[PDB]
Write a structure and sequence with these properties.
This is part of a larger assembly, with 2 copies of chain A (403 residues) and 2 copies of chain B (431 residues). With 403 residues, chain A is an alpha/beta fold. Chain A is built from 14 helices and 11 strands. In chain A, the strands form 3 sheets. Chain A has a 5-stranded parallel beta sheet. A 4-stranded mixed beta sheet of chain A has the order 8-11-9-10, with helices on both faces. Chain A starts with a strand and ends with a helix. In chain B, the strands form 3 sheets. In chain B, strands 5-4-1-6-7-8 form a 6-stranded parallel beta sheet, sandwiched between helices. A 3-stranded mixed beta sheet of chain B has the order 10-9-11, with helices on both faces. A two-stranded antiparallel ribbon of chain B has the order 2-3. Chain B is 44% helix and 16% strand. By secondary structure, chain B is an alpha/beta fold. The radius of gyration of chain B is 21 Å and the shape is globular. Classes of the chains: A alpha/beta (403), B alpha/beta (431). Chains in contact: A-B, A-D, B-C, C-D. Chains A and B meet through helix 2, helix 7 and helix 12 of A and strand 6, helix 9, strand 9, helix 12 and strand 10 of B. Chains A, D: Keywords: Cytoplasm, Cytoskeleton, Disease variant, GTP-binding, Lissencephaly, Microtubule, Nucleotide-binding, Phosphoprotein. Chains A, D: It is found in: Cytoplasm, Cytoskeleton, Microtubule organizing center, Centrosome; Cytoplasm, Cytoskeleton, Spindle.
């Protein structure tokens, strides 16, 4: 089992479309009813859903937000009735310090909800977090929740889908929020970086479609856990096989781009997952780990041949000081198999360091002139000084040095 | 839940409020009597029946404009007690509106604002509409802002002010009132979205083909700007932006808080028919120096923060591509201490066309709030005019014989000199 | 994708543009209001609905011709902002159109052209329609071409100019304007397709049986030439030829870039009925010295490059046979340094007959752009007239008292002498 | 397997009609579907096509062009959906120097496409190039691709169908482009000359029909490779048996000229392939090599008799310093066998030298007066000097001397 903590407008939407994808996959009706064709289903549902006496299924989700508008719109959607009104929380009434201050203020009810959800699962495995690191809501609230959660639950995993601000496109106060959120991520987060720049780049070459792609990534990541097989039957198995990450998915094709039914082997897919173009995020930098989850018919002989050929062709580079993985799953029996075989890749690669070097460069490009610090001084945390900022910057520098 | 109170002071503020509330009633489907044949909650309150009372006060020291409101088509929309009026105006005198005539009305205005705040659940802040070169638009605005800071010392206070134009002017004592207001409110304000009548006249002539616009068209354009600003509170969008977001992303230092407003799809019906206004086109129009609604050339200074508020059929990828194109431009230069100078907001509601207006119906629009050092030249012009008039000591007797001292004149001028120095300092590159 | 912008300057340019855009609307099925009851993309833009706005500007310093456009049958086709007009024309004065009156309009024209270029995706180049012996057709054309070279320093700039006729002439100061324009644009142009009113008059009389043609028939023939030139961009054919192809294949040296336009199937209805116009026949008509639309006898000089643009029911083998026949001819002589002097383009779209025109409906047509040393005689005549008028110093005060100097007259004459020397040098055989 | 690189308008069309002929021969539907009658086909398809999971077949083709119009028209044809949109490339926005400069500029994406296509074939044998040597696009782009390909892939064949400019009919700057393309062909090309003059001459005695004939030549050349038999089961076998070339095809008959069903032996065909009239291109010059591929029923006794009689009749001339070949194939089982037996000839003959002597004469007829060099000086390659031109001319002179 698992819980999802989505914050800010970004996280709220991310959750909306993630649950849309999930209910599509598992044959869950918009109202929580189960379709007749899926009555005898074999798919495991406990992982993301828990059924109710009324036979309806409820997501293990909690909605958090500093503002009402987004969630109010969500509850006007056809999927509104699905969520649990008890879990959803809205502030009665864009800065990280303010977000953390509110988090300190509204500890009690949030952790009440979290405890209630936790006690309903026998074998909870970890946490899932969806948020944006730039905006005031996501950054600060996620920081506070991560801190108090790592404190509260020292034996549960914490996974996040953190969305990073666009850089080629010029939050004016993004450097501070990003740097602080990164501090908290290093200091508490167990383990999926995301950026609007490269994401929209691949989308080209509304937020609805972008986050549909993101939800696709999340669902494909959690597929095998959802669909038990032989190997990789747990999230901890995933994490151990890799341990910051980046992702790529081959069949990112429009509903109109099915006309080119290209004979898609496993070799061509796994190859495509390697190119920098498909890496959805934007010094002979090299890899640390690679995982490829493959959906559809697959012959392990083909997998071995592809691995052999790629190894000989040396299209990849590895650390000199240490000695990939190809897991196979099964598609949901419901969504059309427009793709003969499909592939998702999650990897750890040193080049990601550059991200922080940019943000650090951004942050250093402001701290020398004290820009937009007036609001921060208002909050208690930065009321006296900003040693928090210095510690966070040095922590990020240490991480970059370690990479 | 995210209720906000709009305060309209003076003739300029009251007429802009007329345009703004006409636009709000049209957008939310509210009839001019408050009845409808949620989204309409940050600006309207429901009283039992379908009656929707706007969450605003109309305060003036002159009965004329408020009485026009009281007897117009919206006579039954506003609460009669929230249309506060005096007996004798401030006569373009800051001292009258701040010390002598404004002190007999400020208590009533504060009581009404307290009633409105109590009626709210979560107060986001205040929207103050006023003019810089008016009596009650300057003195009473400064007095009210200071009293609000005393009372609501934490809520954001955004003000929509009509900055005096570089050349055209309707009053002779505008520099005095403008400098004194800048002093007093700069002590007690969050950010001031600025606009010029001359610039909107030029925009109307060039884009809307109108050769004889009135204050009505200017007020309609300003109301469109305000609607674009508050759409995130009033509607649902991909990227929501609140008032605190404006305050945080547009104000780098406490004193440098004077962004300039812009609106890209200012176009007539026929021209809109012949064009294919897209995200890139409207963004480029926003950054065009001729489309600024404050008559300051942006090429004379450096941007420090931009807030692009898109609305309607807008795709985030197109917005990102347009902003990247803007950043790659060489005419548009930013300060070196703001590597990220773009706050982006996207709303799903296209702008609503007012029946009888000149703006054509469009599928998407963008409002750009830009904080730039080009406003320093306008400040320099204003303080130069103040220096001339004060060196001759002209009109000073009118201010002094009304509860003010010449020491206040000197202090306000010194504060404006300090503001110019601050703009110069933030303009220079870091070494 | 291969969008191109056409610029029409002066009365001659604007009227030729009227004919050209009538022809384009007829060819692409676009109604004169921009609606249709792709191919139509290099010259038209779609705005949401079926409205197709032509990708052109109509610039003149005189309101008369542009106002005729604004109120004609095509009143709703052109964007109202792209029909740029002045208040007082250049009065057949190069200085007025280039220095005094043209400087008050060039910024607006450049802004509109920038808007058009931004609206495009891949800009092939510009088509400048103007007259050599006009005020704004010379001075403003040269100014605009130099500003475009400053801005778009890489896009091709092809100009369709009405070269002054050897004998007939409507203005007295034509040599001055022609020499000064040749100087200034020769600095900043790619290739100039030339045409004469006298030659088209002769063509009309001899072929079309018209004894009293107006400027309308001349403009229709010129528009047919332009349509044949741009058919490859607008339609699909066996051998496509772009603007850069014209520039490369017709200009051997940077200064020698003045080809002459020709159109073979200029024929009336009855004569077309009695003839069997084929590829060989139209090619031979193209190379006939009497069918040239510039009154220069090609037998007096040597061809250096020919561009045969066939269209309609044309077979490549027939074209090859006709070109071989032309090469075997002894009256048609080429320069010895161009063993291959034929660029061939074939289009599948037959020419469209304008309802009310004089050209008969044909199955195939060819437009021949020939760069030849026979234009050197026309240049010699023009500079001889310039030398007479300048030796007497006639009309020079009009130019001087309008922002020009006599030194510019001397420099332009020396540049034209250098151009004549260059033509003489490229004429001679290699030894 | 094999790849096709077609450049310029000429190459683009050439490819269009070549693939039209191929799909006609192999019973491939316009959309890439396979007809019911051809389900059990024995013809080998991997050589020019690779099938897709959707059962459709995709050509191993790449479209290159400096201009969009031609390919845009192609994609409006009934055959549009067949091609691979990924492989097709169009320049976003008539000179050889400009073409080579662009080739230097757009190296990365082109070679990305080429590598992707190459890695999908186990036993790639060589390359096929279709282009015109006169126009700016074909000449320069082919030059650049040949250079960087011979550099990249030193173990693959490079075959071209180069179209030469008409000469009896007067590209004004054709001599330069032709001479440079010939330099590159000698310096990098492994191995089919083509000219519009003689091609249209034989056509007589639109580009659609001309290139239909050219595609016929190409397909008949590749037949036996497409249709495996006993001998000549590889392109390298072809090349070794001959090694510049010229071609001729006997049954070049209109769809209306089938009325004369002439009793067509093998002897008469192979004889007809010898005459200069049938050689589609325009000092006791003699042959170097002759190959005749024969389609339809064939008795090797007839072949031996024809060879004996032609040898005795001495209708041909051979080199005095060195010591032909007649290969047999099988027609596709689908296209009507309007011809009882058909013949295609590819030969190497010394007379081809004359071609270059003309072009050299053309080029020398310009270099003495510096005609139309202004544009060339613009590009970087010819920015300083034109030593490239001198080296190319001397290389061509050396080749002529060698002949």
């Amino acid at each position: 089992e698992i819980i999802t903590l989505q914050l800010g407008q970004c996280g709220n939407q991310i959750g909306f479309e993630f649950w849309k994808q999930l209910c599509a996959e598992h044959g869950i009706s918009p109202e929580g009813i189960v379709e007749e064709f899926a009555t005898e289903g074999t798919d495991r549902k406990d992982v993301f859903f828990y059924q109710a006496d009324d036979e309806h299924y409820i997501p293990r989700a909690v909605l958090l937000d500093l503002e009402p508008r987004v969630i109010h719109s969500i509850l006007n959607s056809p999927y509104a009735k699905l969520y649990n009104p008890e879990n959803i929380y809205l502030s009665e009434h864009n800065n990280w310090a303010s977000g953390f201050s509110q988090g300190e203020k509204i500890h009690e009810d949030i952790f009440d909800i979290i405890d209630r959800e936790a006690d309903g699962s026998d074998s909870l495995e970890g946490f899932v977090l969806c948020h944006s690191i730039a905006g005031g809501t996501g950054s600060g609230l996620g920081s506070y929740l991560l801190e108090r959660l790592n404190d509260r639950y020292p034996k549960k995993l914490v996974q996040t889908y953190s969305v990073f601000p666009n850089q080629d496109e010029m939050v004016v106060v993004q450097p501070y929020n990003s740097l602080l959120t990164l501090k908290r991520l290093t200091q508490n987060a167990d383990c999926v970086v995301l950026d609007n720049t490269a994401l929209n780049r691949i989308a080209t070459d509304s937020f609805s479609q972008i986050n549909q792609l993101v939800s696709t990534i999340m669902s494909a990541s959690t597929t095998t856990l959802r669909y038990p097989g032989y190997m990789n039957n747990d999230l901890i198995g995933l994490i151990a096989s890799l341990i910051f990450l980046m992702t790529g998915y081959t069949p990112l094709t429009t509903d109109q781009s099915v006309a080119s039914v290209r004979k898609t082997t496993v070799l061509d897919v796994m190859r495509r997952l390697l190119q920098p173009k498909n890496v959805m995020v934007s010094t002979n930098h090299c890899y640390i780990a690679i995982l490829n989850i493959i959906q559809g018919e697959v012959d392990p002989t083909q997998v071995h041949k592809s691995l052999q050929r790629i190894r000989e062709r040396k299209l990849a580079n590895f650390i000199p000081w240490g000695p990939i993985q190809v897991a196979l799953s099964r598609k949901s029996p419901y969504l059309p198999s427009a793709h003969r075989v499909s592939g998702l890749m999650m990897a750890n690669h040193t080049s990601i360091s550059s991200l922080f070097e940019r943000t650090c460069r951004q942050y250093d490009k402001l701290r020398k002139r004290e820009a937009f610090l007036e609001q921060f001084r208002k909050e208690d945390m930065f009321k006296d000084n900003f040693d928090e900022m210095d510690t966070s910057r040095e922590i990020v520098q240490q991480l970059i040095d370690e990479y | 839940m995210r209720e906000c109170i709009s305060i309209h002071v003076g003739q300029a503020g009251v007429q802009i409020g007329n345009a703004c509330w006409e636009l709000y009633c049209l957008e939310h489907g509210i009839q001019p009597d408050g009845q409808m044949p949620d989204s309409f909650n940050t600006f309207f309150s429901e009283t039992g029946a379908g009656k929707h009372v706007p969450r605003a006060v109309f305060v003036d020291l002159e009965p004329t404009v408020i009485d026009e409101v009281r007897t117009g088509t919206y006579r039954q929309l506003f609460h009669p007690e929230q249309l506060i009026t005096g007996k004798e105006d401030a006569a373009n005198n800051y001292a009258r509106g701040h010390y002598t005539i404004g002190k007999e009305i400020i208590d009533l205005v504060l009581d009404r604002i307290r009633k409105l705040a109590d009626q709210c659940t979560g107060l986001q802040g205040f929207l103050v509409f006023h003019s810089f070169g008016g009596g009650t638009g300057s003195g009473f605005t400064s007095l009210l802002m200071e009293r609000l800071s005393v009372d609501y010392g934490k809520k954001s206070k955004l003000e929509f002010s009509i900055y005096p134009a570089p050349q055209v002017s309707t009053a002779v004592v505008e520099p005095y009132n403008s400098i004194l207001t800048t002093h007093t409110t700069l002590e007690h304000s969050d950010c001031a979205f600025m606009v010029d009548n001359e610039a909107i006249y030029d925009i109307c002539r060039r884009n809307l083909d109108i050769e004889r616009p009135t204050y009505t068209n200017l007020n309609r354009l300003i109301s469109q700007i305000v609607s674009s600003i508050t759409a995130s509170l009033r509607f649902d969008g991909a990227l929501n932006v609140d008032l605190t977001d404006f305050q945080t992303n547009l104000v780098p230092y406490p004193r440098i808080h004077f962004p300039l407003a812009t609106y890209a799809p200012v176009i007539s019906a026929e021209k809109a028919y012949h064009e294919q206004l897209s995200v890139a086109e409207i963004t480029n129009a926003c950054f065009e120096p001729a489309n600024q609604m404050v008559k300051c050339d942006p090429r004379h200074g450096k941007y420090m923060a931009c807030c692009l508020l898109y609305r309607g059929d807008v795709v985030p990828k197109d917005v990102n591509a347009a902003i990247a194109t803007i950043k790659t431009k060489r005419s548009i230069q930013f300060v070196d201490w703001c590597p990220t100078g773009f706050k982006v907001g996207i709303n799903y509601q296209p702008p609503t066309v007012v029946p009888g207006g000149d703006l054509a119906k469009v599928q998407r629009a963008v409002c750009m709030l830009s904080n730039t050092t080009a406003i320093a030249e306008a400040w320099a012009r204003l303080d130069h005019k103040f220096d001339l008039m004060y060196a001759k000591r002209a009109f000073v007797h009118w201010y002094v014989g009304e509860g003010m001292e010449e020491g206040e004149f000197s202090e306000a001028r010194e504060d404006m000199a300090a503001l110019e120095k601050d703009y110069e300092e933030v303009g220079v590159d870091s070494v």
